[PDB]
């Protein structure tokens, strides 16, 4: 019944409320519920509590950051709790159209973003010469200027990491077919989706199962709701690498 | 990239991995060995861990080099936790790299919790990976430590007992509850454990009356001269003598049988059988004898007075056993008067009792020690199986009376005993010869029923091929040093527990110190490197080329001859 | 689709199944393993049943993946009923998909009447499929339960008797007509049956006069003298 | 109407005239090759690699075979919610204790 | 180069030596027989030592002579000192020479 002892008792309360599974009760639902509890207590103006809008606000299809949950067990414990929950992997990863929407801000260095791309591409692709169904992850970045976005694009291309954005030449219109044909191309490491408008055009061109792994810090993109999504909020961009 | 390997074929219990690019060239030397581990996955999260079995690096003049590693899946790692199981599928192609350090540690550390880990060795191909065994299951189940001579098998045995002796929990500075009995025939562990109780023939005193019916017959009966009269009189001479010397509670005096462990005077037993050689009889077929008290018949009420030599028989005709036991009497005096059997048939066995004998065997006397080394080098070989079976049955029955007292008392103050049988094929041979049958069934009793009474065994042998399969299979945990004889290798391979594909083919190729443990106590059958002994077992071997190179020894010949004649 | 497998070779007691697409990777992990059961048919009502004995997934740079499965027919499913006998012929090609849960259950339960099933275990390779024995024929014929140390031999014995006491006609509460006598030498089944009558030497009163002539001469008489 | 269940840790020491009167056989792991040769010879049916699987049967894995079960199959016995009193001694747990002095003379006096 | 031999295949405990020239025509008689010792190295300092187990000299009418030597490694020599337990991986191809008099002595002398 203490701060470090009671907290397990809320899980079965959330579990029978939504008739939900165990892994999204403790990690997705209760962690979001505790965060909005702080937001009505951290402010010193309105400490009164409502219930009608509180129940549906936490089911926003996002795993918001919890600063106390990050604190009393450390960085390594908190990032692996997100590793087994929404990044459930297998030895036989299927060729699905995986989308990685990452919030790239102007305060983020290029090298830290390149380390995350090099881990996403290595873990979510199988570009073997022997496979008949190769796959490559789709990479989308937002929240950055175009000039800073092209610097990451150019440095990635120098270290032999071949990608397509649907723009095979200068002055080209967006060609979604090059993104799909690079998914089955073993010499194309990943796909660099340029922006939101090019992102939403890409989903209409694929017929196979699609997954979305959004990792952000402040703002989140309103992805269409029918496909599976993973929305995880972190502190910095370096936390994303140890989650993918 | 350092290595570019890939699964190109999948079998139900085999993987075929082709290394396409090899650039660093130390991955092949260190991380692509036969006993090495590989992770098979498209990601770093969940990997199918596999051990290598074979490889064939073919090169050609114009063709590309093909490496073709053949491996077998041993289990499944997931989020740092390793699940065993060979029935896990990795659909080819899958990226293959050598297993990282944290995954190899997760093979062994995760299966056994902290309070149950017993570490005495580290992995041979990765010295940073400690290999703990389930220390409860390591010793509660029986151990077989084999490996050819010169491979350091006795190094492996003593290192295990040294770690078990130093297995002290925090709270005390005294000795722990380790109880190790070593049947040391090569006299190696005297210098391995200096704080122990080493017992040679000049120090050990084993009572002859603690032998059961099988061991008493084996010491004194002639198998070729299998006389029913010699067999049966030996029971009546001993069982009646055990009744007389009993002076405690009279309720168990008449319950004494031949196998009951009470004291009898064997000098009186010889005098009884020698008197039965002097058997006379009358018209009524009744043997009449004369002593200082007077004339008496031969019945159970006068059977006790033939135990002294001052008996003069009275009669006319030939008795039932007149002269048929003189083969027995002269064989009995060749044993009790044998100076090499002074430790089992001398005057020391007359005065010692049951309690001091058992205090000597598990070092529970005045000088308590965790390890009791029984130096059986001086024991004659024709009585060596008897002496082993006497101690083996006494310790096992001590463990029986330990448990069933505590079964009806519900106390956790327990005495678990390990018996190290070095050169175990001597004691429990494959052959069904009758001379070693006493020690074969005593070890088999400990091998089968012994783990429930807290008496478990450790079979150490450089040549396992004469160890009987009824006893060697009871050793759930099996440790193998370098084994160079194919007869020993094929005996091991067919007696083996549930292993992995080609780990037992490394037995002839083991270097110095490398071992191989399987069984329920370890997570994975693996080639480890045993921790080097800071106090190794060294036997005092007489150095012939050192002594033969010396000048002709002239003084030390008459000292040998005059000591032979007791002068 | 998720599985595209078909028979490319028929022996008298061996099938050779070639997997062509295998789009869903989840099927291959648990349903295409060795010992798993495949159904072999061109229709959805009459099918062969084949247990996988071996497989070999061959992959190469230029050609497609060669996933080849060795299976052996065990029986026949006609309209949900399983009939044993692997002598039925299925001329190739016959499309192959993994057997359903009710089909594998029908392998081990359709030879037994529903009133006559006594279940104490499930299949080792598929824990969702129970393996009943014929109930009546289990106990009136003698049973030998043998195993090594720590293998659960005492657990297997205790579980079987536990289902025997739990074997009840659905008409009553209380004790059923099960009668089990255990000769416990190692004192292990007192815990496993807490509602039983454990009889050690403190409470047992065996009358000595019910012994015959031979047993009275071992309780009282020494045979050596 | 009086039948028997032969539960033995060591099947090779039961009488052949008694062990063969059984019809249903439940064979768990058997490490002793004397046990395996006795069981395989007296067994009513056979399974494909019974020589190699009898050592290799895991915990709780048996082989139900005989008159009551038509297909001799490898099963997993249902987990005991009330398990029997297991016989084992956690040696390292006992050996880590300090030297037991009191419970030694009790064993000698009752012998 | 009187002898030009080369490893073409490497097993855990077996090597395939391909003699390419064999100009001397006496090296094969004494130093490439079964039981002779070979020098598997690409440098003069550190060398694998392998004993010849079996050879085969196939000769055809038009093609080249394929002298194939099957040898098994026994140990390692590092600047004149022999270390037993030969399992160090010699990545093919490698120059193969008969072991000189000093290495073969070092197999038996220094131990």
Numbering used by the authors:
A (entry chain J): 151 to 394
B (entry chain B): 5 to 571
C (entry chain E): 5 to 229
D (entry chain E): 458 to 568
E (entry chain D): 5 to 115
What's written in the study?
Here, we biochemically and structurally characterize a two-component defense system DUF4297–HerA, demonstrating that DUF4297–HerA confers resistance against phage infection by cooperatively cleaving dsDNA and hydrolyzing ATP. DUF4297 encodes a protein containing an N-terminal DUF4297 domain (a putative PD-(D/E)xK-family nuclease) with predicted yet-to-be biochemically characterized nuclease activity and a C-terminal domain (CTD) with unknown function. HerA, widely distributed in archaea and bacteria, encodes a DNA motor protein, which can hydrolyze ATP and translocate along DNA. The enzymatic activities and anti-phage defense function of the DUF4297–HerA system are activated through supramolecular assembly.
To reveal the assembly mode of this complex, we further determined the cryo-EM structure of DUF4297–HerA complex at an overall resolution of 2.87 Å with C2 symmetry imposed. The high quality of the cryo-EM density map allowed us to build the CTD of DUF4297, whereas only a partial part of the N-terminal DUF4297 domain was modeled due to the weak density of this region. The cryo-EM structure reveals that twelve DUF4297 molecules and six HerA molecules form a giant assembly with a molecular weight of ~1 MDa. The architecture of the resolved complex has a shape that resembles a human head in a hat, with a 172 Å × 172 Å × 180 Å dimension. The HerA forming a planar hexameric ring resembles the head, while twelve DUF4297 molecules, organized into the upper and the lower layers, resemble the hat. HerA forms a planar hexameric structure with a central pore in the DUF4297–HerA complex, which is significantly different from the nonplanar conformation of HerA alone. The base of the hexamer, supposed to be the DNA entry site, is closed by the insertion subdomain. The HAS domains and two layers of DUF4297 adopt a nearly C6 symmetric conformation with a continuous channel. Six DUF4297 molecules from the upper layer are held together primarily through mixed salt-bridge and hydrogen-bond interactions mediated by the adjacent CTD domains. Six DUF4297 molecules from the lower layer do not contact each other but form a tail-to-tail dimer with one neighboring DUF4297 from the upper layer through a loop connecting helices α3 and α4. The loops connecting helix α1 and β-strand β1, and helix α2 and β-strand β2 of CTD of the lower layer DUF4297 form extensive polar interactions with the HAS domain from HerA.
